[PDB]
DNA sequence: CCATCAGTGTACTAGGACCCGAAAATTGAGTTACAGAAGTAACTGGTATACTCTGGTTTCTCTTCA
């Protein structure tokens, strides 16, 4: 099994494809938006907390 | 006439909740220790909203000088 995996022989569950449902196409958008908000907020939130600590 | 091009008649998926039972885990009582923390169960002040005469007031005729 390890030697087979080393040769890059895809197991059955790796070649297993499933269609992108519509609610997933919505969750993705909402989640990317939320993650970008968090990533942009974290620096400024930390700066604000540091100013408060000083 | 051999190209092309919807429909069709199905088992075979794809999500999509949902259920059925089993097995493991817990709860619960019983004891007896142990220390300390919750968790009510109790008496005992403390200060305000009505409250009840009361002290003053107010004309209104009169009192007392003047």
Curated annotation (Swiss-Prot):
Q: Which residues form a coiled coil?
A: none
- Highest taxon above the source species: Eukaryota
What changing residue 35 to N does, per the record, is: In NEDRSO; uncertain significance
Q: Where in the cell is it found?
A: Nucleus
What is the disorder linked to it?
Answer: Neurodevelopmental disorder with motor regression, progressive spastic paraplegia, and oromotor dysfunction: An autosomal recessive disorder characterized by delayed motor development and developmental regression after the first year of life, followed by progressive spasticity with gait alterations, paraparesis, and oromotor dysfunction. Most individuals have cerebral, cerebellar, or basal ganglia volume loss.
- Biological role: Part of the SNAPc complex required for the transcription of both RNA polymerase II and III small-nuclear RNA genes. Binds to the proximal sequence element (PSE), a non-TATA-box basal promoter element common to these 2 types of genes. Recruits TBP and BRF2 to the U6 snRNA TATA box.
Relate the assembly described in the record: Part of the SNAPc complex composed of 5 subunits: SNAPC1, SNAPC2, SNAPC3, SNAPC4 and SNAPC5. SNAPC4 interacts with SNAPC1, SNAPC2, SNAPC5, BRF2 and TBP.
Q: What's the protein here called?
A: snRNA-activating protein complex subunit 4
Give the organism, scientific name.
Homo sapiens (Human)
Q: Which residues of the full protein are shown?
A: 165 to 218 of 1469
């Amino acid at each position: 099994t390890r030697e087979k995996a080393a040769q890059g022989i895809k197991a059955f569950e790796e070649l297993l494809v499933t269609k992108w449902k519509n609610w997933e196409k919505a969750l993705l958008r909402k989640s990317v938006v939320s993650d970008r908000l968090q990533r942009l907020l974290q620096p400024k939130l930390l700066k604000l907390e540091y100013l408060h600590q000083k």
